[PDB]
Amino acid sequence: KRNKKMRFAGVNESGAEFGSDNIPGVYGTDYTWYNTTAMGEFISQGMNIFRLNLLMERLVPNTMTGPMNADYLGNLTKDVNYVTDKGAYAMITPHNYGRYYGNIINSTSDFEAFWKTVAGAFKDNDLVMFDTNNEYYGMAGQLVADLNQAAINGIRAAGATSQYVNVEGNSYTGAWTWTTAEGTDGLTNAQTMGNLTDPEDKILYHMHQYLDSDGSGTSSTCVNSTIGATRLMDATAWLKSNNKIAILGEYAGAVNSVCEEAVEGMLDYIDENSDVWTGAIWWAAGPWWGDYMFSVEPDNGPAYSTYDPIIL
Numbered sequence: 001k002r003n004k005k006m007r008f009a010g011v012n013e014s015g016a017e018f019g020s021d022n023i024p025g026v027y028g029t030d031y032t033w034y035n036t037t038a039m040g041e042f043i044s045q046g047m048n049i050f051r052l053n054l055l056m057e058r059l060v061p062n063t064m065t066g067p068m069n070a071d072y073l074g075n076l077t078k079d080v081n082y083v084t085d086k087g088a089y090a091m092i093t094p095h096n097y098g099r100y101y102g103n104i105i106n107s108t109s110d111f112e113a114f115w116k117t118v119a120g121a122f123k124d125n126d127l128v129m130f131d132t133n134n135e136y137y138g139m140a141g142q143l144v145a146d147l148n149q150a151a152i153n154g155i156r157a158a159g160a161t162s163q164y165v166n167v168e169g170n171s172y173t174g175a176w177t178w179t180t181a182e183g184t185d186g187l188t189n190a191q192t193m194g195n196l197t198d199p200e201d202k203i204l205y206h207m208h209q210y211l212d213s214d215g216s217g218t219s220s221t222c223v224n225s226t227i228g229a230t231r232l233m234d235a236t237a238w239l240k241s242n243n244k245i246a247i248l249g250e251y252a253g254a255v256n257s258v259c260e261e262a263v264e265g266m267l268d269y270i271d272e273n274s275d276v277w278t279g280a281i282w283w284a285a286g287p288w289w290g291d292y293m294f295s296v297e298p299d300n301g302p303a304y305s306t307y308d309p310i311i312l
């Protein structure tokens with residue numbers, strides 16, 4: 001019900017980043033790519049954005065300054081092209097939590113090199129979005145901002161000038177903790193991330209929101225009937241104040257009455273405040289979820305029949 005009131009409505013595709021113990025890992029054992037048929041169904045239903053998750057170390061092995069692995073990049077491009085050739089947006093998401101081979105990415109120059117490399121492969125695709133990194137955590141707030149800034153600079157330096165760059169905060173880029181959670185340097189996302197600059201002026205602030213008590217997305221129990229919209233409120237104020245726009249890049253509820261009402265209430269809030277929220281992206285689709293309580297993968301997603309119409 002809630003899509004044509006949003007610039008971007010769609011689903012995460014999760015699976016190509018799985019099994020991160022094993023890098024490079026092996027297709028079919030540790031990770032997989034996406035089901036173009038299922039993505040095609042979502043597109044023909046009216047969804048227009050897919051957040052394609054991947055692992056940095058598989059796309060660019062050894063060092064962040066190295067060349068790409070052509071087979072992994074090949075499959076990324078195949079899934080991206082299926083989506084963008086049909087007019088939907090493909091967001092490229094390194095699902096790495098600010099960490100490269102386990103270690104916090106401390107070098108902004110390594111990060112800019114990585115992003116200049118990945119962006120060069122897609123610089124002429126106007127339907128591609130770049131997502132600097134999924135859910136920075138346990139780091140200094142200033143380094144996370146500086147890493148995000150290094151990514152924008154890398155992306156534009158490669159000549160990828162038409163694409164929106166999704167910048168993510170520290171502390172799992174949670175919306176509800178945007179003004180409160182502090183990094184190891186004592187600074188919040190509100191305190192560090194407003195400074196980000198882009199010569200092409202296409203920065204989308206990329207936040208996540210879950211509805212259980214600790215916001216982990218771990219429990220099928222949603223706090224209460226309005227916990228979704230209420231947790232967006234502080235971040236919405238912040239966005240209007242500093243004249244920024246955002247997208248809710250991850251969200252989900254379980255299949256129960258309270259989670260359902262809380263999810264639609266949140267998506268209603270986003271429509272009410274579409275001056276700063278450009279849309280929302282469900283977590284998650286992808287073929288290797290089985291009975292995962294948030295899986296909206298059409299053929300076996302337990303959340304699909306319930307929340308696919310809500311998104312739509």
Ligand SMILES: *[C@@H]1O[C@H](CO)[C@@H](O)[C@H](O)[C@H]1NC(C)=O
Pocket residue numbers: 035037038041287297298299
């Ligand atoms: C791919 O997606 C289609 C549409 O949802 C589904 O019917 C099919 O079973 C899926 N294939 C695999 C291998 O999961």
Ligand SMILES: *[C@@H]1O[C@H](CO)[C@@H](O)[C@H](O)[C@H]1NC(C)=O
Pocket residue numbers: 027033071072075
């Ligand atoms: C890419 O996808 C093909 C299936 O089309 C698979 O055979 C291959 O192993 C995959 N390779 C990588 C690196 O993902």
Ligand SMILES: *[C@@H]1O[C@H](CO)[C@@H](O)[C@H](O)[C@H]1NC(C)=O
Pocket residue numbers: 223224225226227230
């Ligand atoms: C749900 O819990 C939050 C957390 O305190 C609270 O702010 C909100 O008002 C609650 N909603 C209802 C309907 O009780």
